[PDB]
Design a binder for this molecule. Structure first.
Ligand SMILES: *[C@@H]1O[C@H](CO)[C@@H](O[C@@H]2O[C@H](CO)[C@@H](O[C@@H]3O[C@H](CO[C@H]4O[C@H](CO)[C@@H](O)[C@H](O)[C@@H]4O)[C@@H](O)[C@H](O)[C@@H]3O[C@H]3O[C@H](CO)[C@@H](O)[C@H](O)[C@@H]3O)[C@H](O)[C@H]2NC(C)=O)[C@H](O)[C@H]1NC(C)=O
Ligand SMILES: *[C@@H]1O[C@H](CO)[C@@H](O[C@@H]2O[C@H](CO)[C@@H](O[C@H]3O[C@H](CO[C@H]4O[C@H](CO)[C@@H](O)[C@H](O)[C@@H]4O)[C@@H](O)[C@H](O)[C@@H]3O[C@H]3O[C@H](CO)[C@@H](O)[C@H](O)[C@@H]3O)[C@H](O)[C@H]2NC(C)=O)[C@H](O)[C@H]1NC(C)=O
Ligand SMILES: *[C@@H]1O[C@H](CO)[C@@H](O[C@@H]2O[C@H](CO)[C@@H](O[C@H]3O[C@H](CO[C@H]4O[C@H](CO)[C@@H](O)[C@H](O)[C@@H]4O)[C@@H](O)[C@H](O[C@H]4O[C@H](CO)[C@@H](O)[C@H](O)[C@@H]4O)[C@@H]3O)[C@H](O)[C@H]2NC(C)=O)[C@H](O)[C@H]1NC(C)=O
Ligand SMILES: *[C@@H]1O[C@H](CO)[C@@H](O[C@@H]2O[C@H](CO)[C@@H](O[C@H]3O[C@H](CO)[C@@H](O)[C@H](O)[C@@H]3O)[C@H](O)[C@H]2NC(C)=O)[C@H](O)[C@H]1NC(C)=O
Ligand SMILES: *[C@@H]1O[C@H](CO)[C@@H](O[C@@H]2O[C@H](CO)[C@@H](O[C@H]3O[C@H](CO)[C@@H](O)[C@H](O)[C@@H]3O)[C@H](O)[C@H]2NC(C)=O)[C@H](O)[C@H]1NC(C)=O
Ligand SMILES: *[C@@H]1O[C@H](CO)[C@@H](O[C@@H]2O[C@H](CO)[C@@H](O[C@H]3O[C@H](CO)[C@@H](O)[C@H](O)[C@@H]3O)[C@H](O)[C@H]2NC(C)=O)[C@H](O)[C@H]1NC(C)=O
Ligand SMILES: *[C@@H]1O[C@H](CO)[C@@H](O[C@@H]2O[C@H](CO)[C@@H](O)[C@H](O)[C@H]2NC(C)=O)[C@H](O)[C@H]1NC(C)=O
Ligand SMILES: *[C@@H]1O[C@H](CO)[C@@H](O[C@@H]2O[C@H](CO)[C@@H](O)[C@H](O)[C@H]2NC(C)=O)[C@H](O)[C@H]1NC(C)=O
Ligand SMILES: *[C@@H]1O[C@H](CO)[C@@H](O[C@@H]2O[C@H](CO)[C@@H](O)[C@H](O)[C@H]2NC(C)=O)[C@H](O)[C@H]1NC(C)=O
Lengths: 450, 456, 456
């Protein structure tokens, strides 16, 4: 519901329109990640290594287990669950909801813990524990692929002091990478907004294996990964055996009805005698008839739609909304002073270019396309020129579908502005200066007059 | 010293209060990192590999050694002054230097002493053939030497010296070296313009050792508790002391500092909660973290710090000034607290502050589980304060929590509050609003100008 | 053409002046990256692994191949012109394209020609069984083929084909493939929406080869000059030319540009130094880097560039406009230079500019050692200019540098300067101030509206 014609005349060519999809209705699945390799195969070339490593790991795992109990000790079941408000004291909206979620996981948590001994037994990278009825809980073990493929197969090929040294390194390195995610950085383990790729650091970042193991598969398996929607949550932490139980949340991508995200392609336009760029949102969210900004930064942009892990719409100035609809004089523009800046764009077979700053010649008519000084852009199409040559490219145009006098129409330009961070402080200060002075002329004249 | 009651009424619920700790009084310790694996065990399946690699490495190491000499050649002991001891920097020589850069150079000179002491074992360093090696240095004062890609040469290339071939044992060694350089370049490449300074994270430096900063530290002895909190808060820095372009190893001085909590200072956190006012949801635009020292309220770039449950740990003071109005708003002048329109499905609807609930029961459905009733919110209210007295155990959607007793005005929900002005924070709009405002301002200056000229 | 003297008096000490270099005139070279290891050496301990992996990879590769055809199917030669000779894009067909995207397509077409030339050795590519392998393009011309996870299959899976088992030799191969995909997605995942453009860093593309961009480049041949500076400045880009969904390899065209320092232009850096004015410390809020071309002073987003000691290297012009007032301030109108209150312990207190010192001796102990006289700063003073004239060798705190002779007004310290207005830059405060200002503005437009109606 934007006025694309006027907008294009100030360098905002109409681009691709995408759908707006958001994650929802997750479906949990639980798996275990043992963060201590099984070295029973080389119990001789161990040394203090395994002992110290256990102390180190218990160090970084303890705060996490603790933070989880602070919630397990305040959730009792009686006729759903009920959180102990006074006990919890201070909690954020989401943090509590994550705790409620933790309690239900608990049920299936203890059920898993039953195979505690069976978990330690694991001696392979990926292991399935179905020693029970239908309870087949998966167990990924860290640095296991190493212990098996490389340390064991050369148990004698090297030595026992070396088979020990190399195992210490692989453990120290794993901790070095593991720390980034589970260090003191993981202040709130209660919440469940942690990306699955982040959690997979406990398994060497092989989040591919971690998800396929669990058996997920969807035509959006990747769009969900990149849009950071496949989150995970720590359910339990065993400080004895050194393994954790994470609950992977796998959602669906559903598209918000009556809503699209229109993209505008910026194109340098000429006005006074300098190049200019309109300072207007490059992406616009429209729902029904409501135009709003969107922090598309935190989303995944594909060719057909914008996928976000949550609604990211934000308010928009009133003037900015008017500008986008027809009030072009309310559209800011900043001076262009760089060699590199978009000079033209192709919107639906038609060209929109600032010839005053690019070589526009008509390959068909052999002639060259000229731009008046009074013209901001040019609209090179089928009619004017069947096969134009903007700069080094040669493209064949189509027929423009708007006002047939676009190039002799004209448009009211907006006010110029500067967006440099330093200058925004300068301008705010500069403006207040003038404002204080004019409030003194209005104050001295008001007191002298009446 | 903030007015938490009024603040909560506009969606800024009182959260956790943390201490303000900063790093200080570092204690140095030096170690050597050899960036060339010892391949004497397979000197036959080498080939040009080791030769080219040396050329490549000498390439990226040279600028660093250079930048260090630019300071070693301008620091002489200030011998002769019986009333001042130390080093003296050649100002005219150095030319242009920043405050800190010089201080880092002065620091470099002091390491030169123990630097040369270490260099004495130059031959002993090249000898290293293990990942981590202890080169007994003086009486009890030892020096350690970490060697890059060594664990590979030993565990994987040697143990299959014949299992594969000699052309392959060569190819695989070239790759491991090229990859190491690929990761090493992000830190010691053209990027490392100023090697004089000592503000480089230890994890960054450890890239020379495959990023195994854990081993690099354990091997040095981290006799501390705040060890992890010091790591994450980027306080354990390192500094290049010496660069040997022959043997290809560098001497880094690790600074292990210690935390210390600033006296009489805390960092109060506010939990944002969407509040209803006109007929739209709103969010107050006020700092989410506030630094208070004595009675001074100031902003803090808590971004660059580590936030734990009990305190905010920073690698340096990060306090910054605060508008005057913003300080007033935080204390009671709520009409001076901006607010921006909410237009997103997801945004905090309620928060729990000291057993009590604060919710927008206009944009969320709040019911009282015990009585069954619906805890509804008036139109001229911003939030609600659901506590013992109102609802003993409420239901905010998929949650059921048991409340406690609010300790403030018992008429919080019938009190009311003066709302602030609305604003838009989108970057693009801040330019629009600055431009828009100046428009109006130029026009009103002309009405004041044309009416001032016409009147007197 | 800046007024460095006045600028220094408000804490903007003159720093190093660097050249302004930009990339240009690239020279292409093509190589192939096979993203499927050759496992013919262990065809028995395979299992479904290789099959599934092929399905997975075909998944993430398909969209890329597709996006490339959307351009190959709309570019035909321009047969029929005496003057002009080249390619012609099907505008109506392409529909919506960005300036650069088309130019990248035109570039793709001219690659394709040599692309097919390479594809001729399709079978020869699959044959590859080594990390890096060299092929025969046209006798004199050659093309290279890097194979993913090959070094693993050879050095570690084969050499222990029996040392372990066949179920394990299979498990370990599955992991190495899954992990490779895990890292490969960051760059070739849905992230890679537009494969037509050629602005993708070479290090990014090298993810297909385990991020060993060193080998990918070394094995490709690179010019000695400004090479690392070209890597770090993100100028060595790459572009996907072809995608083979059968054999699973891609042909990338690496662009090697040459830096070209744009004439009549330098980037002056200013060193910030806390200055004293009222009774508080202050910092001038002015660009720390300034781009000057001829006589035009403009801002520059030096963030996206590589800063070396000698020059600023950027992958494209990054100049941006500058307020008018800000330009004046930088030249002499110091009352037009904003300043923000300093409230942090750590903040630069002095800087060395051309052998001369510039310090806030009110907050840092300054004394001249070559005379024993304690160097003192008055209340009315913003900074101090400690040089040869007054002190041959001074001592700030515990630092000791020997100064040189200042070359400007010999009464710099008794000169004085008009201070600018104070401001607050906290993002939260900028919203508060914009709101605050508009408040006042609406009120003054009502006094001008009520007075104007009452008066005439
Ligand atoms: C305050 O600082 C100023 C400079 O910031 C001090 O003056 C300088 O002091 C230094 C060392 O005390 C002098 O060293 C000299 O360096 C020049 C090189 O300069 C070039 O440019 C000059 C421009 O005026 C030319 O005149 C020169 O011809 C030259 O091309 C040498 O040429 C000089 O001889 C001199 O000494 C060097 O040469 C001797 C020769 O035997 C060698 O032993 C060393 O190589 C010496 O380094 C410098 O000349 C001088 N510059 C001036 C005065 O402009 C000043 O002393 C400081 N105040 C005090 C008194 O402390
Ligand atoms: C000016 O520019 C425009 C756009 O760049 C050009 O005309 C428009 O585009 C085409 C011109 O060919 C036209 O579409 C009509 O032709 C289509 C193609 O038919 C052929 O399809 C196969 C070819 O590969 C093959 O089966 C066979 O050869 C077949 O004839 C058909 O889909 C259909 O006939 C199209 O016309 C109908 O559709 C339009 C659009 O919905 C509608 O108006 C009518 O229903 C119409 O009958 C477009 O319609 C053209 N647009 C218009 C209105 O002009 C044109 O080439 C340029 N002018 C010149 C001569 O330079
Ligand atoms: C808020 O509004 C303010 C006013 O609208 C903005 O400040 C104004 O900035 C403009 C520049 O865009 C200034 O205009 C010109 O200033 C000098 C001096 O010329 C002027 O002298 C008198 C002013 O007292 C008057 O006779 C005229 O205003 C006259 O223009 C000139 O050097 C420039 O113009 C020259 O150069 C340009 C090329 O760039 C040519 O096109 C022109 O023909 C001319 O040769 C400036 O444009 C203006 O002085 C200043 N304030 C005034 C008096 O209007 C302020 O920037 C804005 N804030 C923002 C950015 O949001
Ligand atoms: C730091 O001080 C060093 C002094 O110990 C200095 O090293 C020497 O630098 C000069 C460069 O001028 C080199 O000299 C070269 O050129 C002369 C020509 O007169 C030849 O006679 C020499 O053979 C040589 O090729 C010296 O080789 C070099 N000596 C050392 C110590 O290696 C550094 O350059 C100083 N660093 C800086 C940046 O000033
Ligand atoms: C509303 O809930 C309140 C709890 O948040 C409750 O008051 C508090 O009740 C606890 C016990 O549930 C008291 O704790 C202990 O200490 C006191 C003082 O020594 C003892 O008398 C208690 O028996 C108990 O062991 C808290 O001290 C108490 N808070 C205070 C100081 O009042 C309210 O009573 C509930 N409101 C009503 C009346 O329903
Ligand atoms: C500076 O303050 C001005 C008023 O104090 C403001 O202008 C007025 O802005 C309000 C909305 O903020 C507009 O009123 C609209 O209010 C709601 C919007 O949700 C609806 O009921 C209607 O759409 C209603 O129009 C006024 O129209 C507008 N007044 C006018 C014509 O100027 C400025 O926009 C403020 N500018 C800054 C710098 O913030
Ligand atoms: C969890 O709640 C229990 C309530 O029963 C608290 O009691 C602890 O119980 C454990 C049982 O192993 C003991 O080891 C502790 O000594 C008990 N603590 C106290 C203060 O008596 C316990 O505080 C809570 N656990 C947490 C979060 O630490
Ligand atoms: C606009 O200018 C006024 C001055 O006329 C600023 O208000 C002063 O701010 C300082 C520091 O915060 C106080 O010490 C003065 O007492 C204030 N004067 C008063 C009461 O008006 C105001 O902060 C400026 N605002 C902007 C946009 O920077
Ligand atoms: C590009 O042009 C071709 C040529 O007509 C289109 O045709 C398909 O090409 C694939 C190979 O890429 C064949 O296997 C199919 O059988 C062809 N089917 C058709 C005629 O649609 C191809 O689809 C075009 N690519 C696109 C869609 O841009």
């Amino acid at each position: 519901i934007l006025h694309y014609e006027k907008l294009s005349k100030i360098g905002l060519v109409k681009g691709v329109t995408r759908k707006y999809k958001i994650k929802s209705n997750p479906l949990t699945k639980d798996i275990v990640i043992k963060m201590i390799p099984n070295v029973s195969d080389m119990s001789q070339c161990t040394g203090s290594v395994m002992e110290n490593y256990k102390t180190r790991l218990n160090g970084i795992l303890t705060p996490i287990k603790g933070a989880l109990e602070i919630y397990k000790n305040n959730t009792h079941d009686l006729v759903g669950v009920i959180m102990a408000g006074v006990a919890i004291g201070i909690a954020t909206a989401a943090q509590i909801t994550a705790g409620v979620a933790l309690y239900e996981a608990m049920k299936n948590a203890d059920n898993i813990n039953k195979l505690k001994s069976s978990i330690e037994s694991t001696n392979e990278a990926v292991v399935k524990l179905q020693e029970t009825a239908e309870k087949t809980v998966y167990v990924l073990t860290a640095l296991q692929d190493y212990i098996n493929t490389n340390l064991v197969p050369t148990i004698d090929k090297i030595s026992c002091k070396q088979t020990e040294l190399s195992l210490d390194l692989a453990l120290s390195k794993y901790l070095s990478d593991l720390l980034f995610v589970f260090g003191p950085n993981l202040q709130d383990p209660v919440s469940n907004s942690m990306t699955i790729q982040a959690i997979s650091q406990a398994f060497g970042g092989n989040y591919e294996t971690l998800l396929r193991t669990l058996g997920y598969a969807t035509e959006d398996f990747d769009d969900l990964l990149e849009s950071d929607s496949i989150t995970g949550q720590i359910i339990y932490v065993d400080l004895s055996s050194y393994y954790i139980i994470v609950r992977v949340y796998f959602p669906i991508l559903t598209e918000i009805q009556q809503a699209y995200i229109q993209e505008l392609l910026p194109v340098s336009f000429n006005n006074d005698d300098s190049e200019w760029i309109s300072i207007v949102p490059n992406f616009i969210l429209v729902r029904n008839t409501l135009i709003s900004n969107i922090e598309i930064g935190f989303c995944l942009i594909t060719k057909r739609s914008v996928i976000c892990n949550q609604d990211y719409a934000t308010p928009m100035t009133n003037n900015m909304r008017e500008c986008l609809t027809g009030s072009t004089e309310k559209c800011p523009r900043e001076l262009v002073v760089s060699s590199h800046v978009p000079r033209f764009a192709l919107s639906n077979g038609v060209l929109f270019a600032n010839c005053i700053s690019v070589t526009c010649q008509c390959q068909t008519t052999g002639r060259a396309i000229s731009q008046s000084g009074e013209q901001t852009l040019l609209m090179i199409d089928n009619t004017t020129c069947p096969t134009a040559v903007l700069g080094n490219v040669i493209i064949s145009l189509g027929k423009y579908l708007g006002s047939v006098n676009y190039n002799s129409e004209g448009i009211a330009i907006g006010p110029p502005v500067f967006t440099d961070k330093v200058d925004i402080s300068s301008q705010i200060s500069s403006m207040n200066q003038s404002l204080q002075q004019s409030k003194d002329y209005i104050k001295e004249a008001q007191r002298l007059l009446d």
